[PDB]
Design a protein around this ligand. Structure first.
Ligand code: FAD
Ligand code: NAG
Ligand code: NAG
Ligand code: NAG
Ligand code: NAG
Ligand code: NAG
Ligand code: NAG
Length: 518
């Protein structure tokens, strides 16, 4: 933990090589084009720029345009803000009926998220069967952590929840650790101890400022292709609606880093995907693959809200209670009269009048899956349809039951006892915002899980390694095309995956360079 970042202002030095996509002089040949300046995309583009000419295209603007993205205090504002098509938070509703968000900004979802930093479960690497260079993975985590991760200072509510998890049997006590392991710990945060947000856009500062160019408000609409099928470039439009082209040259590559939703969407619009589906939309099939936009996952969030009779201090999540079958945390949150879109799964949810503890459990995997399909067959700015099929797999429901029973145990701890409105024996002594925990039968817990599910926001899949990609993240059947982002895996790396996806952008960047050099 020598390596971690210090308290520091958000480093915008990289803006010296950020340009409006309206600039036609960005058009031309590069060694690499990275689509999506997000969690994976920014460290990938920065890494490739050490040796080669890179163009990073991001649909959103720069985070300075939306100052409430730059502090812990600002987190609520960004989810409360109406989506006018330019804001850093893009709102959507799954076909399941569950409200959700994705980022639209340079730095991607690291500019809007809850700041929690963790490394992958060390068993994840062997689970994938990918031949990881595990020494390099660990060097890559330290490169991220040196730049943007701190050891969080103590927060009253997080310490209460930590004592509660330990008392409720989420053992052992792991103290301060970045590692995803069974038990209770303080993990890292991308919010510094002054409340400054640090994010994936800062990793652009590790890029070579003579090799890296970033275009913002660059909406990438199509991947361009070469009978030896290759990606050759992209079409992108600017904020005025004019079209632009860029190309890769020589042994260069296009990498799609547009997220679980953006990646499959762009692959389908470009004619990569299921043959009968694309041919049903009269989209010319460049590469038939049945799995583009298939195996899309959203880990369920289930929760209760308690309203302590004395105010609690608002906190960012730093304390985690991990078991193999559920991952638990709690935020303490100020009251509001404008809802945080997707905090609760629909717009019809009570507003809190006082400070509340949002106490949550995450279902691992999950095993339930759905898909991304096109709404428009031409317009990338029209959000695709996304369905997660929450609790379609009975294992997921069984795991939520275990998690909700454990939150029951948590509300019974001496740790939490001071936060009750009534000094009675039962957890009905708490005041609840919304639905409280339900008897000695699983069926009431099942109904609670099914009825009150929300998004954890850690959705993943749609371009899986083993289905769309090979073990080098290449799109099977296409040269000079890769995918690096959360679309690539069908299970979580851990409870809080930003750490893994930040590492993955640089790691795959280093594998591309090593491949090159031979
Ligand atoms: C509200 C919220 C809170 C979260 N909290 C945490 C947490 O505390 N800790 C944690 O570990 N994880 C958290 N997560 C999850 C984690 O942040 C994400 O899973 C991860 O950041 C995803 O990275 P990505 O690179 O796949 O996508 P992104 O970071 O979203 O990057 C994709 C980028 O592509 C851009 N893009 C999309 N389509 C196009 C296109 N056609 N042309 C150009 N650009 C395009 C997008 O604007 C975006 O910048 C949270 C998620 C959300 C939504
Ligand atoms: C890009 O230029 C247009 C004017 O042509 C302007 O409306 C837009 O806000 C600019 N975007 C950025 C990110 O500077
Ligand atoms: C990588 O770091 C983890 C701690 O996150 C450690 O458990 C593991 O042994 C390291 N692996 C290697 C190959 O050094
Ligand atoms: C800071 O955080 C935790 C809370 O108990 C603990 O590690 C440490 O003793 C605390 N120090 C304080 C409150 O000064
Ligand atoms: C870590 O990953 C492996 C599955 O790959 C799993 O068996 C184990 O339960 C996970 N542990 C936790 C605590 O999530
Ligand atoms: C597009 O999304 C809308 C919601 O605006 C949905 O109701 C409509 O039927 C969808 N169209 C297609 C082609 O999926
Ligand atoms: C749930 O998940 C696995 C796929 O991972 C599958 O084997 C099982 O049949 C699925 N559905 C169930 C058990 O309802």
């Amino acid at each position: 933990h020598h390596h971690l970042a210090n308290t520091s202002a958000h480093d915008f030095s990289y803006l010296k090589f950020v340009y409006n996509a309206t600039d036609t002089s960005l058009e031309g040949s590069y060694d690499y084009i990275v689509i999506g300046g997000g969690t994976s995309g920014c460290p990938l583009a920065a890494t490739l720029s050490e040796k080669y000419k890179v163009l990073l295209l991001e649909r959103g603007t720069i985070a300075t345009e939306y100052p409430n993205t730059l502090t812990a205090d600002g987190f609520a504002y960004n989810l409360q803000q109406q989506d006018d098509g330019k804001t850093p938070v893009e709102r959507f509703v799954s076909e399941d009926g569950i409200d959700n968000v994705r980022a639209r900004i340079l730095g991607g979802t690291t500019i809007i998220n809850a700041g929690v930093y963790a490394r992958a479960n060390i068993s994840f690497y062997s689970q994938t069967g990918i031949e990881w260079d595990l020494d390099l993975v660990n060097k890559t985590y330290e490169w991220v952590e040196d730049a943007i991760v701190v050891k969080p200072n103590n927060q009253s509510w997080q310490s209460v929840i930590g004592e509660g998890f330990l008392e409720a049997g989420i053992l052992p006590d792991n103290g301060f650790s970045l590692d995803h392991e069974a038990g209770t710990r303080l993990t890292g945060s991308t919010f510094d101890n002054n409340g400054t947000r640090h994010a994936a856009d800062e990793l652009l500062n590790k890029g070579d400022p003579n090799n890296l160019l970033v275009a913002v408000q660059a909406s990438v609409e199509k991947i361009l292709f070469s009978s030896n099928l290759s990606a050759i470039g992209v079409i992108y439009t600017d904020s005025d609606g004019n079209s632009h082209q860029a190309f890769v040259r020589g042994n260069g590559e296009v990498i799609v880093s547009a997220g679980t939703i953006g990646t499959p969407q762009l692959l389908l619009l470009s004619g990569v995907g299921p043959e009968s589906y694309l041919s049903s939309l009269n989209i010319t099939v460049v590469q038939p693959n049945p799995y583009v936009g298939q195996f899309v996952y959203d880990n369920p969030r289930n929760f209760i809200n308690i309203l302590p009779p004395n105010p609690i201090e608002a906190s960012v999540v730093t304390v985690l209670g991990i078991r193999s079958d559920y991952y638990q945390v709690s935020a303490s949150v100020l009251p509001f009269s404008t809802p945080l879109f997707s905090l609760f799964p629909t717009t019809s949810y009570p507003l809190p009048n006082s400070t509340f503890a949002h106490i949550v459990s995450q279902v691992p995997g999950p095993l339930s899956h759905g898909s991304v399909t096109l709404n428009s067959s031409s317009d990338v700015r029209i959000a695709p349809n996304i369905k997660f099929n929450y609790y379609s797999n009975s294992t997921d429901l069984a795991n939520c039951v275990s998690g909700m029973k454990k939150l029951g145990d948590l509300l019974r701890t001496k740790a939490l006892e001071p936060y009750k409105a009534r000094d009675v024996l039962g957890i009905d002594g708490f005041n609840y915002l919304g639905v409280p925990l339900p008897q000695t039968d699983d069926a009431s817990f099942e109904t609670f899980c099914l009825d009150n599910v929300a998004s954890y926001w850690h959705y993943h899949g749609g371009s899986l390694v083993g289905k769309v990609l090979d073990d080098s993240f290449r799109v099977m059947g296409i040269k000079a095309l890769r995918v690096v982002d959360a679309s690539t895996f069908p299970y979580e790396p851990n409870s809080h995956p930003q750490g893994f996806y930040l590492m993955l952008g640089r790691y795959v960047g280093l594998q591309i360079l090593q491949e090159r050099s031979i």
